[PDB]
Amino acid sequence: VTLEDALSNVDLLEELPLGIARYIEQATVHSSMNEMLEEGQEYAVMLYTWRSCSRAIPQVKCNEQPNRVEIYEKTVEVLEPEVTKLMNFMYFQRNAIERFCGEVRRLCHAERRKDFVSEAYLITLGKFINMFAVLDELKNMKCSVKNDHSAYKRAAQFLRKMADPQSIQESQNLSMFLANHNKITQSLQQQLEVISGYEELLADIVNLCVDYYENRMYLTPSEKHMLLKVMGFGLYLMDGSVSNIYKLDAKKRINLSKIDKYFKQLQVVPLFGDMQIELARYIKTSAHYEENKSRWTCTSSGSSPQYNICEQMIQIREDHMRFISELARYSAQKTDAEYRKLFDLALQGLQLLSQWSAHVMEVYSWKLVHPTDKYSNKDCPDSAEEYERATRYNYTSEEKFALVEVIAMIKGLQVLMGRMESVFNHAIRHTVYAALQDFSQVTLREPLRQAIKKKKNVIQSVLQAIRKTVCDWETGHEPFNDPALRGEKDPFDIKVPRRAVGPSSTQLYMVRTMLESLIAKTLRSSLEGPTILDIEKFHRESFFYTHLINFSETLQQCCDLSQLWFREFFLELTMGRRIQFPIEMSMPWILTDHILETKEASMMEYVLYSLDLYNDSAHYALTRFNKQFLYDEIEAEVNLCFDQFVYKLADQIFAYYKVMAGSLLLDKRLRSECKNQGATIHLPPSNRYETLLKQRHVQLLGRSIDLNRLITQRVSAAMYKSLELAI
Amino acid sequence: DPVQREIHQDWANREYIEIITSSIKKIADFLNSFDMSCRSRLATLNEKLTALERRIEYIEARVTKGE
Amino acid sequence: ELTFNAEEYSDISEMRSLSELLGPYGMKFLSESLMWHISSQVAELKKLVVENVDVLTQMRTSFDKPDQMAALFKRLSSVDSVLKRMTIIGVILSFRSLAQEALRDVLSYHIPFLVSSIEDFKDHIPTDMKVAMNVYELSSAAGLPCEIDPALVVALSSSPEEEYKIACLLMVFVAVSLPTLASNVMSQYSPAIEGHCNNIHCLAKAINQIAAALFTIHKGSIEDRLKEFLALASSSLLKIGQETDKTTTRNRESVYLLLDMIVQESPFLTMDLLESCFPYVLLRNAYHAVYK
Amino acid sequence: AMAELQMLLEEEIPGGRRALFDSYTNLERVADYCENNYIQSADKQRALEETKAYTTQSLASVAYLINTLANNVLQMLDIQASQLRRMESSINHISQTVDIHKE
Amino acid sequence: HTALPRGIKNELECVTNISLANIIRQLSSLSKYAEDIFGELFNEAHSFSFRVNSLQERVDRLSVSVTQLDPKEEELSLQDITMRKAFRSSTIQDQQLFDRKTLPIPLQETYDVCEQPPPLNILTPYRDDGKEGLKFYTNPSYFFDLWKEKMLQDTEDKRKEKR
Ligand SMILES: [Cl-]
Ligand SMILES: [Cl-]
């Protein structure tokens, strides 16, 4: 019992007296905003995957050139459909900013400011500002885009391509847009600062992310990283000519200390693709940072990795053991408890996987923004380009072994979890239904009883709106013989049914949203103590219901390592010097080849897991980026790297067993005699090739590879060469 | 009343649907694991057959003349 | 205070040299003496089973009730002796294997035409048991490895259903005892040995051949009795995977590897069966720990 | 038996395979029927219960067609496995015979 | 997703009938996906059926040839060691397993619906370096070309270091 609790009990004495269509509309607005986020994501993909067409176009060295017109004609033919995408992008961001700001103005009205906003919608608005950040940084990076347009604009004009005043002003606007750095961000600020009290809404958004992050209200790594990115860009926007985050902090409207602690512990997270975001940058570039430097500690990082993977690996390996040991034990009708346990495991497993994937990506992310040099790595050439210094030379042998460990532990558990899906799906739906019905039919009886008794008509309507919406009475009809319905107590039993189906998305959203308004004079004031805890409890636990209901989808999102291969951002930075990066700079091959090269015994059973990273990237290029050339390049890399994989594997496998043979037959007395003469003939280090030799169908890029067959081909050829040599 | 009734019927309707969709997923899983199981047997058959083919070519070479 | 080096008397070259000198007659006599000592160990094991017949009988049917299963284990006696004797049997069998493998290579070299017929004759049999022991006795005399050891059977053949239960309970007794090995510092798996310092890796061979022999003598189901053993062993080992005691879990991962060895060594158990009751990711991590 | 293999390779597997393709085209027809029968239905509750009936029947059908074809494919592989078993036995005898001759 | 029950007649029966009609369509889709699986299994197994038969008849007539062998008459000549090549077993090694031609049909279809790169090869005939315009945008063979040139240079650097 805290002092605050004892004081609350005392305060209770001092206080002792001596619409549905509404939520439906909000859900409509929320749903509409989300569609725009999806649309923005499409534009983010367009930018990130946009390679220079102009560099592939033959230039006109002089006005006196034969094919001058032909080239220009073909230039328009190629770039025109692409320029259209840019027009749409310009139009989208313009409308998106108006849309968002219009919503901010609505929620910041003097009267509305006193109103209630759902957490889910604050999050959505949070993802909106991040969308702007992403789109702006992508636009800032892509010189290819700006140059391609100019190449089109320069060709369309020389050809006198028919264009009306509107078409001309349209082209002029696009140029100005593509030529202005930070245009999206700058426009966002202008339209926000013209709104009185806008900083109060953003404060609510930031405070919510701080609360979620602190209380672990997230499942997937992307969800975890989104919270931080919102905090950052949020404070940045809240720090302008009309608002001041430090004075906001003084009034305790926000807690800069917590945010500072979060940024210090986790400094870099993915922004989009291989393009990362250094969280502390938002702080350092804020309008009032210079005069308030001493307030921060996350602004100091250095070229030193903050955490020791060795300490992290010990814990990870422990958790892998502890959880999988228990899970493996769970592989006529069950009881509620038995279904709940499987429910808990499914969640715990997803959370564990998320932690691991987060570890890998966060390490990789930090490395990308902190490329090494000669001072940190003696073997690192001073002429080595940034990307190679960010990947290849930026990992020690032990670091590369550890990463493959985590990657293997992730993919390994993912397989077990997947095999458990059918059982999970059933146990989860049973648990969510039971929890929902037990809460709505029984738990809500007391609160409803008091609302009716004390004429809390507003609360009653909400409680009844909830029960009416989801309740599934055993008799098909509600119990009209209920005393709490009249406001009186019980001298009473209700039989709650058990179905294996979760509530509809609308049912769950409405229930949570309505419960949220109760624990938000406020309605919360008119509620007893114990009942508020009950509502808060169910509201907290029901946060993961949607994730669990969509177990299959959630599982993949907790094991996403597809970004290790993509490097369009760094490609863009080479200014045409690189059409791609060699395989020695490619993470998947860096991690895989390292095991093949060192022949590390403890890692030999892990090597296929690092190779599997190509599947993740291939699938992502085909289903998310939706670009053919990206897959062509992944496939071409796998094609090259897999041949090397077979060669090196077969090579060391034959040598290993040849040495074993020579060692097994070497005279024992001779060994001892050589030892006694300080010339010990060293024994062969044991290894672990058996599992690799047993692989009969390796799934890679859709193909089924018989690794055993390929190795046999090489090993057989080695046997013949040995015999041929001896003779 | 007509709403409460519709909601009770919806729960029943959706459970039935969940049961069917769940079965469609068990069929899909069998298909996959069956595909993999047959891939292993085929590789094993291919492995043995290839060896037998080579062995026959070898024995023939012992009983015949050369070029 | 040993006066000899074991490796200079038991390595591949030595056992082959021994086979040269003793031939089929001599090496067969060698194995017979080995099996006798094994019979002695099995006789003592049965006593330990009878001495715990009640508890073991309960553990066999209450295998899915952890609380009761754990409480029953505390009522068992002579757990160390069961593990100690089975290990001895495993060692003896490991030696016989070295001798048989050596003899086999030697015979294929001296009498290829005879070996050629023996191999073809053993591989392509349908089938009756009494007639199979005759094909197996001939085969093993030529150093050929058999699924059922004729010599072991004969050695262990010296109430019919009272005896069968003991064999069944013996498998249970051993299955539930394995986790105990994790508390022994010597149960450390070594890459240099590709086994354990205290020879517990020989348990793989002991468990398999003793099962194949006993449940052949009693005309039971070898495959079923081993399936039961694996399930009970996998279950018992998974339970210690959630404990934290630095003592009882010291060599937990090295003991985990026994399951892999037991399945590899046994023609009646497959990696698929093992995977469904003990995920390889645990074994993978186990190997990593000991090899690093 | 070679007869059983020919029966599996030439009729039963190709047949049970086409019966699966027929289920592909026949079910999309049953789907449209369930929607058209509902549109013309004067008793909506009745039309639904009949759709549910076709749905349950559609599930039982697909599971049966796959099961039947699955068993056939397995029997085929089992037979081919024994073919290699007998062939190796014959090749070994040929090998032994040649060794005897060379000696 | 969208809305809730308003208690109106036939509201629920209509939406579920659509949901069930879709499920029956999924079963129709499942029937086709199963075919593709059983199909690629039959095809390979059917191919082995050929080899098996071809080998069996090859084994059968060899079993007869060996019967006719006669040690009493078999004469040995040195021209086998002088005029006739030595027996050579097959030395086939599979490589380049991820060429586009090995891409399974299902993934090929998912690939075709993906976005193609700009038709930059339209400007190829107008280049002076006789190079393909598309290679300045995307070049899959870049990985091998760079790795090959690296191995040759590393073979030289390593070769001149010993001297
Ligand atoms: Cl070693
Ligand atoms: Cl020898």
Using a 10 angstrom Cβ sphere, with 0-12 exposed, 13-18 middle and 19 or more buried, the burial of residue D23 is buried
Q: Which amino acid is at E59?
A: V
Which two tokens mark A19? 């619409």
Dihedral-angle region of residue A302 (phi above 0 means left; psi in -120 to 50 means alpha; beta otherwise): left
Choose among E122, E123, E150, E141: nearest CA to A579. Answer: E141
Dist. CA C176–CA C237, nearest whole Å:
8
Contact partners, residue A345, CB within 8 Å, separation at least 6 = A326, A327, A330, A424
Choose among A284, A317, A304: nearest CA to A406. Answer: A317
Dist. CA A198–CA A206, nearest whole Å:
13
**How close is the nearest chain D Cα to the Cα of C117, in Å?**
8
Range of the domain at B18: 1-63
Q: Is C192 on the interface with A (CB under 8 A)?
A: yes
Q: Name all contacts of E30-33 with Cβ < 8 Å and 24+ positions apart.
A: E30/B24, E30/B27, E30/B28, E30/D62, E31/D20, E31/D21, E31/D23, E31/D24, E31/D27, E31/D62, E31/D65, E32/D21, E32/D24, E33/B28, E33/B31
CB contact under 8 A, C279 and A668: no
**How close is the nearest chain D Cα to the Cα of C273, in Å?**
20
**How close is the nearest chain E Cα to the Cα of D15, in Å?**
12
| CB environment E101-125: b (16+ within 10 A), e (fewer) | eebeeebeebbeebeebbebebbbe
Bridge partners (DSSP) listed for residue A278: A268
Unique residue bearing structure tokens 């390593």: E158
Report which secondary-structure segment, H or E, holds C98.
helix C79-110
Residue B38 belongs to domain with CATH number: 1.20.5.110
Using a 10 angstrom Cβ sphere, with 0-12 exposed, 13-18 middle and 19 or more buried, the burial of residue A190 is exposed
Contact partners, residue A413, CB within 8 Å, separation at least 6 = A320, A323, A324, A349, A352, A353, C281
Q: How many beta-carbon contacts under 8 Å exist across A and C?
A: 80
> Which spans in A108-220 are helix H?
119-141, 143-158, 165-179, 183-193, 198-215
Distance A689 CA to ligand 1 centre (A): 14
Nearest by CB to D66, which of E23, E34, E45?
E34
Nearest by CB to A324, which of C5, C191, C282?
C282
Chain B touching partners, 3 or more CB pairs below 8 A: A, D, E
CB contact under 8 A, E118 and A53: yes
**How close is the nearest chain E Cα to the Cα of B49, in Å?**
8
Choose among A353, A407, A418: nearest CA to A613. Answer: A407
Contact partners, residue C78, CB within 8 Å, separation at least 6 = C48, C51, C52
Contact partners, residue C228, CB within 8 Å, separation at least 6 = C171, C172
Task: Give the distance between the most distant pair of CA atoms in chain A.
Answer: 111
CB contact under 8 A, B49 and D84: yes
For residue A120, the tally of other CB atoms under 10 A from its CB is 17
Chain D contacts of C112, Cβ < 8 Å?
99
Reported as half-sphere exposure (CB side, CA atoms, 13 A), residue C19 has a value of 26
CB contact under 8 A, E96 and A82: no
Choose among A708, A717, A718, A565: nearest CA to A646. Answer: A708
User: Which chain A residues have any C-beta within 8 angstroms of a chain C C-beta?
Assistant: 317, 320-322, 324-326, 328-329, 331, 405, 408-409, 412-413, 415-416, 601-603, 605-606, 664-665, 667-669, 672, 683, 685-686, 688, 691
Which two tokens mark C217? 């003598």
Torsion of CA A449, A450, A455, A459, to 10 degrees: -90
Distance A397 CA to ligand 1 centre (A): 20
Q: Is A635 on the interface with E (CB under 8 A)?
A: yes
CB contact under 8 A, D81 and B45: yes
The angle formed by the CA atoms of residues E5, A509 and A199, to the nearest 5 degrees, is 135
Task: For chain E, give the residues followed by a break (C–N over 2.5 Å).
Answer: none
Contact A108, A198 (CB under 8 A): yes
Cite the beta strand spans of C31-82 per DSSP E. none
Distance A655 CA to ligand 1 centre (A): 16
Q: How many beta-carbon contacts under 8 Å exist across A and E?
A: 147
Dihedral-angle region of residue A455 (phi above 0 means left; psi in -120 to 50 means alpha; beta otherwise): left
Distance C15 CA to ligand 2 centre (A): 10
Method: X-ray
Dist. CA A283–CA A92, nearest whole Å:
28
Chain E touching partners, 3 or more CB pairs below 8 A: A, B, D
Dist. CA C222–CA C211, nearest whole Å:
6
CB contact under 8 A, A56 and E134: yes
How many secondary structure helices (H) and strands (E) does chain C include? 14, 2
Dist. CA D77–CA E42, nearest whole Å:
10
Chain A nearest-CA residue for E144: A640
Torsion of CA D17, D19, D21, D24, to 10 degrees: -140
Dist. CA C155–CA C34, nearest whole Å:
10
Contact partners, residue A549, CB within 8 Å, separation at least 6 = A428, A429, A432, A502
Which two tokens mark A632? 């062509």
Write out residues 33-72 of A within 8 Å (CB-CB) of E.
51-53, 55-58, 67, 70-71
Contact C225, C168 (CB under 8 A): yes
DSSP state of C5: -
- Ligand nearest the Cα of residue C192 is 1
Unique residue bearing structure tokens 């009751």: C277
Contact C98, C6 (CB under 8 A): no
Q: Which amino acid is at C149?
A: D
Contact A637, E146 (CB under 8 A): no
Contact A642, E96 (CB under 8 A): no
Chain E nearest-CA residue for D26: E28
- Ligand nearest the Cα of residue A663 is 1
Chain A touching partners, 3 or more CB pairs below 8 A: B, C, E
Distance A685 CA to ligand 1 centre (A): 4
Domain D1-103: assigned CATH number: 6.10.140.1620
Chain E nearest-CA residue for D76: E45
Dist. CA A464–CA A448, nearest whole Å:
8
**How close is the nearest chain C Cα to the Cα of A706, in Å?**
18
Chain C contacts of A601, Cβ < 8 Å?
191, 291
- Would you give the end-to-end CA distance of chain B in angstroms? 96
Chain A contacts of C194, Cβ < 8 Å?
686
Distance C190 CA to ligand 1 centre (A): 8
Q: To probe the interface with D, which of E13, E30, E31 has the most D CB atoms within 10 Å? A: E31
Contact A438, A522 (CB under 8 A): no
The tally of domains found in chain B comes to: 1
Chain E contacts of A632, Cβ < 8 Å?
138, 140
Write out residues 35-64 of D within 8 Å (CB-CB) of E.
35, 38, 44-45, 47-48, 51-52, 54-55, 58-59, 61-62
Contact C179, C237 (CB under 8 A): yes
Reported as half-sphere exposure (CB side, CA atoms, 13 A), residue C208 has a value of 25
3-state class of A684 per DSSP? Answer: coil
Give resolution, Å, one decimal: 2.4
Dist. CA C189–CA C182, nearest whole Å:
11
Contact A569, C259 (CB under 8 A): no
Chain A contacts of E96, Cβ < 8 Å?
639, 643
- Would you give the end-to-end CA distance of chain C in angstroms? 33
